[PDB]
Design a protein around this ligand. Structure first.
Ligand SMILES: O=c1oc2cc(O)ccc2c2oc3cc(O)ccc3c12
Ligand SMILES: O=c1oc2cc(O)ccc2c2oc3cc(O)ccc3c12
Ligand SMILES: [Cl-]
Ligand SMILES: [Cl-]
Lengths: 260, 260
């Protein structure tokens, strides 16, 4: 047995096609877990991630699910257990971003956001509790915008994650009857191929700066003067889902490199 | 002009039929506002509240709305403005409580709770922003269970209010362009005719105590050794919606008599 490692464990990771989720899936594999690469859209991308994990020496399988549909969350978890025999760890990176002044937010947008970010993650936790081995791990994704960062015209998204913060604190109480810990990670601005299409929303008069200037401004918000990267979040998830992360339970960890 | 008072103002109060909302509606009337008594169920009860407000010397009107239905929120606010000429203050006391272990929470229950407590209150705020006079006031209802109090088997409700906390902080940014402040009150256990039917959920082995013992236990949780009452919340709402409450903006105030 090697401390910090996940040898002999089985982990399920949602939102694995891209960005943060992909880095998390690969990292848990690097740590020695077999990985269910759950994803929402591109099967080719997901199989890419599977292939990286196998190249590292761990087994993986891509299982698609629309996490807005609770019946698909149930089948995802059933299939995860049937394939690998058991499931120890469940990490949700499922979510969508949204912007707009309160006055302009529609019913349809509210539902688009809450169905995935809040309702979807809630039922990922339910199904993880139901399927997990004793002593397991659940990690959901919040955001620095929930409590630590105030962005005008970002109320809907901020509240979608505020819900998750409260969920995990109470989930840790309920899930203690299988000795499963429940936490959330709350990333700040993290660079992916999508960062550049939305970074203007986070800066006053953002469209009057170039993408590169906006990335650099995001970098300077941390006193370390660099951007957050998907590996930064994976590193912390990896610790939380390890044996050694056990005493962190019912908490939300803001991962912004010291910006707040 | 009398500091703290609301003379010449028009206020709309949701959830006014009963409990906290009723006390809030009557209080804003006692402070000199004309009141739209919005309610969900009993018209007779709502007209009772209207009658109290008129007996105090202020005008009031009962307008029903199902706050789960955004089209009815729009009409409620349109009708409020058409009746009184303008609207200055909007207070939501809309919500339902829910209990259950994570493992047993259904899609239907999630939706029952979030549609009112979170989605409904969000759109009350939207419509209040859209209809309010400059310099107005929006107050939503959170709960001590959002952040300050951890109740096992209460994750769904806790997260429904966690969302509201994040909403109001960001709403205060957006609503500043009409100089409207936005806050929430987060009551703890507050005695109403309903308190006794659910107080067992908040105490380990609660059903093995009598209703009166449970009420007394709730009283002892505050270092003032009394229960919270609807007037306790009304008093604070009244301050927030006054001129003198202006510098409290974007905040959630936990009203538990010092329990936390
Ligand atoms: O581009 C971003 O994407 C994000 C995404 C999130 O989920 C949370 C925060 C951010 C975020 O914060 C910033 C601060 C700046 O000064 C500049 C850019 C950003 C920026
Ligand atoms: O009965 C209650 O109803 C509530 C309703 C709420 O919305 C929040 C908190 C409570 C609450 O906290 C308690 C603590 C005790 O020790 C005993 C009873 C209660 C109790
Ligand atoms: Cl994905
Ligand atoms: Cl009501």
């Amino acid at each position: 047995y090697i401390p910090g490692r996940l040898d002999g464990k089985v982990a399920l990771v949602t939102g694995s096609g891209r960005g943060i989720g992909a880095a998390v899936a690969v990292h848990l594999g690097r740590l020695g877990a077999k990985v269910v690469v759950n994803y929402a859209n591109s099967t080719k991308d997901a199989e890419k991630v599977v292939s990286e994990i196998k190249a590292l020496g761990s087994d993986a399988i891509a299982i698609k699910a629309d996490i807005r549909q609770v019946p698909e969350i149930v089948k995802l978890f059933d299939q995860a257990v049937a394939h690998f025999g058991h499931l120890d760890i469940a990490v949700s990176n499922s979510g969508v971003v949204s912007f707009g002044h309160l006055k302009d937010v529609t019913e349809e947008e509210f539902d688009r956001v809450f169905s995935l970010n809040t309702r979807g993650q809630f039922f990922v936790a339910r199904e993880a509790y139901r399927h997990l081995t004793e002593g397991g791990r659940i990690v959901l994704t919040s955001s620095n915008t929930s409590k630590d960062f105030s962005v005008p015209k970002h109320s809907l998204y901020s509240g979608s994650k505020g819900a998750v913060d409260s969920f995990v604190r109470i989930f840790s109480k309920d899930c203690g009857d299988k000795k499963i810990t429940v936490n959330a990670v709350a990333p700040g601005g993290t660079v992916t191929d999508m960062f550049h299409e939305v970074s203007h929303h986070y800066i006053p008069n953002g469209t009057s700066y170039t993408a590169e200037q906006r990335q650099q401004m995001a970098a300077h918000a941390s006193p370390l003067h660099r951007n957050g990267w998907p590996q930064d979040v994976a590193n912390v998830v990896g610790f939380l889902v390890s044996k050694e992360g056990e005493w962190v339970n019912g908490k939300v960890l803001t991962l912004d490199g010291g910006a707040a």
